[PDB]
A = this chain, B = another copy of it.
Amino acid sequence: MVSKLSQLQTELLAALLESGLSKEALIQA
């Protein structure tokens, strides 16, 4: 069900939050 694109998005979203980006900033952008 999950495409390579969705898997890459999932992994980058996770890496962004682990790197310190706030959920609020995540939201705005």
Contact = CB atoms under 8 A, between A and B. Distances in A.
Number of copies: 2
Interface residue SS majority, chain A? helix
Contacts of A1: none
Interface string A1-29: 00001000110111111011101011101
B29 A5 contact: no
Contacts of A26: 13, 26-27, 29
A16 B21 contact: no
Contacts of A5: 19-20
Contacts of A16: 9, 12-13, 16
Interface of A: 5, 9-10, 12-17, 19-21, 23, 25-27, 29
